[PDB]
């Protein structure tokens, strides 16, 4: 099962990467909503 | 209820165990098929009248049968074609839900009573009555590679040695032979016949006499003479068995006493019944088997069993015979299955990773890893118990529900963890407190989701049958999910979660998790500070929301719609159309050139070409064909340029160059019944006995006007064939009577020689097979050959056909259609780009109203369904919408607060529309079911925020803003946890290429885009919604 | 023939007056024939496209072209009751006593379908009224067998 | 639905033993109530059609579609569709030494719809260019044509 | 339901009738059913008002 | 008046070859005899609607 | 018997075969259900085993 090793790795790499993007977006959407006030 | 099972973990574990057993059993007994039954039930009546012409078939068979389809039950419409090859097909289409077995028996029984009204020769061939289906499990080709067998030979071998064994194979429901067993072919020579003053009639008479079964009786049969000893059975004449015996048939004794044997005036050989279709596979003669899956059978097991049975026949094949598998949906279904298990498993691993990331202890992490599979298994148990199958639609229904199932697990567990950190309560009493906060909402959520998704089960017709694969999969998954969340996860939390010290939010941990925790607590302050500012100035955001909604409507109305995405199914067809009157040989040269292109320019991609000369979809005849191309497996065609769509376009472009033939490749529809989303199916009808010429002209009038609104109508065209030259031969009765030549000898001479005649049967190696007479090809090719056939007069003289006949060319129809028993002409077309089919249809109706007196129209097929089941749609959004609101009103005991939830809807839809518009996808059914799971989940998130806020205001007396901020603060984490897991879990589908990627792309991109915007926007806007709604009321 | 003559055969049958016009101005063979020997004039005469019969003849169409069974466009026009086209063809030299392979003449064909006017025209231009077919039958014989008393009177 | 399948299963065993003339008029097996649900009447307000004309129009243009409608057990025409009626005169038949049998034989032979096959039909010779249906006798369509039978 | 479907099918033919033809309705057993049923509906409504 | 083997080859095999794919069929049996008579019997799963 | 000659059991004997093949599975599932029911009534994993 190369595929199961392969799925595991993408998942652990991807949990941080996508997490940052959604947190980045709300922090950033928050700051825009503060300016737009 | 949750409290009951917090103190009864073993009872909850019993339930869970049951459910997994039931689900496990279901996993073993569930049928597996690519698609469920979709098209409404149809029955097809099919007859052959060998050597007949379209009008003769129509006027002596089709009209007779149609006139007797009376008193049959549940009939929506009936259609027919009669064509110039001597074939009629009558199709009766019944209301969805009609029992196909009963429908078929009522049609077959009315036919039976019409049989005495049809020609003897048509009665002798039979009229077949069958369930209409175009869904083959696989097509097995059988070919001969050493040039020692004709396809006539192969077909007989297949029929005699293979078909019956495949028919008996486990799970196969039907087998069609793509050929026919041998027949005894007697090829007549007119010059020899005349030499001996004989005619085809004489040959026919002799064969019927000397190849026949004659009853005799018995020795010592009852009543016996007393004293009789022996009782035996008398065998007299029995059927011939061999060409040698047929050749020895006695035809005449001359005056000198010499004998004329059949073989002296006819060539005799075993051959085919039909010489209409020449099938080749990479240039070699071929036959094949078309195999259909039985009801309730497993496709994967049956295909494997078929291959096993074929395997054990291989040792006995004659030299040069070889099995090939041009068409086999099973490999595709295998990948679909794997992809769906892979998806479910990855989802369970992602929830494990995300639970650990946020909660940082393995005990919490185990709980969804237990709950989710219990719900999945239990859902196959429910599914099976009303006998859905594992099919493509139900399989994607399962992945579209993953978000809802995962969210139920996360919500229950996270809330217990939160309560423990915020209060120091022991796991058991914290779970009790936690479940008290959300059990009401979870039930409310179950009602609301059941009011979004149930309504789509009740559409009608084919698209209704599709929607309800999804509707019942998802509703059962979601109902099992809430049951498990109220009984199993609470018990598990209470017994498996470890206590959390009051105030501990992990900010003082070391390494990564302390960092993560500090960082996330900080991120939560930002967000709430921002929400606080938003809530001090609600006006600007109501305007922003309206902007979003308008942008949603605009985006929506631009996105073109379809039904189901095309796939690289490993095959495509290419169609070959020559002009009128073109011969079999000309078509073969074009098919040969087509096959040569594929095996040469696409050498890497193409495994095989099955070139079938004589069979097309818009009509049959010598002048049409189809080359059916099968590819190497996806694994060896990497890259968008070696996929079907690419090959197709390149192929069609290369063939634009063939002159004197219309030749063009197209992909297969995912489901062959559905035609186009864009398209319509129009029937023009002769309602007052106008006649063929006038109907044709009315058709042409309509087609000319359609062509003048290219803004609205495109590709508006006839489905059928155009009049062609034919040969009018008039028999002069007076001259016939004056010569003493009987009309019956004349007409059977003509028909038997030029059309062929099925005389009777013989027995070839234990199997009954047909006998045919016909002229040798070389004496039935041209008008001058007419005068070479002689008939014997009453006075013994042989009279050439030219003495009593006259002949001229005229034009006539090689395919006559009827619709509900009136002559008809089918017209196809589609809406021009940017136009709805409704608009195109409305114009077609307008144009049709201006046609000649007596000419009417009707809408059929896909357009019948469109008309009736668009009528339905509005009433069902209305019922959905009302019940959603009524459930919310009960949940919150308020007539107004429900609006603060419902407003959340467009927030998910806008990101889904955006994702689809940007990737150039369409509004197809996968996108619209995804559009509904996204709405479901964001509605869920909002229901919990508003429930949390309201409880804070009602129970802890907090102010409007204070409660909203606190509620939104509490739900931030679980909302994020769920979104992270779902967006990641659906990511492989969005980027996926290869087999089934069309569907995977359709469900992934819309869901991921919607989940992004629903997540990011909802958390800012429902606190706005809640605050402005409470303020107004 | 060629690609343009196949286009013309089609345009003549479908009655696309404009296409014919253009193809005339690009030299499409007016004597292109399909498998049974039908020229564009045969087709226009059969399906009744008068303007195209006129156009075709002005471009040198053989007015007395015959199909593989010996039938001319005058046979077709007269049989199917296209009176103008019959007149136009005769005015352009169509052989009025043409016989097809069966000995059938245009007068015969019109008499059988009971086209009285066409029968009169044909006679006017010198149709031989006593023309016999391969069975020795005259237009008169035909009108009595068909019980057409009007036509029987004209032939007398 | 099944009483009818069962009955008809047994009837078809008897069918071949019935007179050809009974068979050709068509036997029906119907499952319907014995009372009329409704009578749809049809008249001509301009008096441009006789009773016989109306019943033919009704029979030929309306009755079949109603009989196929769902829930319609039996449709009884209050009239008769047209047929071609041949009214024999015994005196003229004797004058020409004919009987009704000679007339019937002539009608079958000369009001015929015959399959005659094809030019260049399959299987063909090599190099064939022509494929064309052969059309021979067709069914008659007017009294005039029935009258000129020889 | 069956009477409604018949009427619907008849409606499809009327447009193509030759001049003069006209459908008339001399005998129908269904109208009484619909009408007697609706009178019962009326008494239910009236009863609620009373 | 036919004989078992003529009856088998022309009637019994013809029917049996088309008795495929029927729903819930457990086994099938037939005899063909020298009086020219055939009986083909299909036996269905218990609980099948006869 | 010689190769190519097989056998099958029919009628009442087919049922005999089937009703012994099933029996093991029907004692096993019966016992499991009894055990799981007992665990739920007494809310205990041991009284069931006892
Ligand atoms: C001109 O424009 C169009 C556009 C689309 C179509 C496709 C058609 N719906 C369709 O059914 N297409 C087909 C096939 O692509 C594939 N297939 C597989 N085997 C066969 C088979 N034989 C019996 C010879 N015959 C026909 N189709 C086979 O399954 C489907 C039907 O059984 C045709 C014409
Ligand atoms: C336990 C007290 C809260 C009441 C929640 C009841 C759930 C309402 C569901 C809507 C029913 C139509
Ligand atoms: C499998 C269902 C068995 C029903 C047991 C109900 C009794 C539970 C009460 C525990 C106290
Ligand atoms: C199949 C059920 C597994 C039970 C494991 C429980 C072990 C503890 C038993 C004592 C509880 C009273
Ligand atoms: C009035 C006390 C209610 C007791 C609740 C028990 C419900 C258990 C359902 C399984
Ligand atoms: C599938 C059986 C697993 C049973 C787990 C029960 C754990 C007992 C803790 C109360
Ligand atoms: C008390 C056990 C609840 C049963 C639900 C499992 C699904 C089986 C439905 C047929
Ligand atoms: C025995 C049938 C194979 C079923 C295993 C795959 C289940 C996938 C769930 C949709
Ligand atoms: C189906 C998952 C197996 C159950 C194991 C439960 C672990 C906790 C009990 C001590
Ligand atoms: C076809 C059924 C679609 C129903 C949409 C209703 C949306 C309300 C969501 C709260
Ligand atoms: C018209 C057929 C629709 C059947 C589906 C019924 C839905 C029940 C959902 C609980
Ligand atoms: C095939 C129609 C059957 C409808 C019943 C489904 C009920 C769903 C329960 C989850
Ligand atoms: C489907 C929406 C029903 C509308 C009810 C609104 C309540 C009025 C506000 C108190
Ligand atoms: C059918 C939906 C009815 C909605 C009721 C609204 C009540 C108004 C409360 C003032
Ligand atoms: C034509 C039927 C469409 C059913 C799915 C509804 C789409 C939901 C959009 C809000
Ligand atoms: C064929 C006999 C084998 C029986 C083994 C299983 C017994 C049932 C366990 C409850
Ligand atoms: C073949 C499977 C055997 C299962 C044994 C069941 C014993 C249950 C007692 C708890
Ligand atoms: C005291 C709770 C009773 C639960 C019974 C559930 C099983 C029977 C339907
Ligand atoms: C093996 C199937 C068992 C069904 C529920 C107990
Ligand atoms: C298969 C039918 C299963 C229904 C049983 C419900 C307890
Ligand atoms: C919850 C499942 C009960 C329905 C079982 C009967 C299935 C018949 C199609
Ligand atoms: C086969 C219909 C079963 C319906 C039961 C659903 C609960
Ligand atoms: C067609 C009436 C439907 C009622 C729902 C609102
Ligand atoms: C449906 C009643 C609404 C009035 C407030």
Residue numbers in the entry:
A (entry chain H): 1 to 37
B (entry chain B): 1 to 1033
C (entry chain D): 11 to 166
D (entry chain A): 101 to 250
E (entry chain A): 301 to 350
F (entry chain C): 51 to 100
G (entry chain C): 851 to 900
The authors write:
Drug efflux pumps play important roles in intrinsic or acquired drug resistance to a wide variety of currently available antimicrobial agents. AcrAB-TolC is a RND-based tripartite efflux pump, comprised of the outer membrane protein TolC, the periplasmic membrane fusion protein AcrA, and the inner membrane transporter AcrB, which cycles through three different conformational states during the drug transport process: access (L), binding (T) and extrusion (O). A small peptide, AcrZ, has been identified that modifies the activity of AcrB. In this study, we report the near-atomic resolution cryoEM structures of the AcrAB-TolC pump captured in both resting and drug transport states.
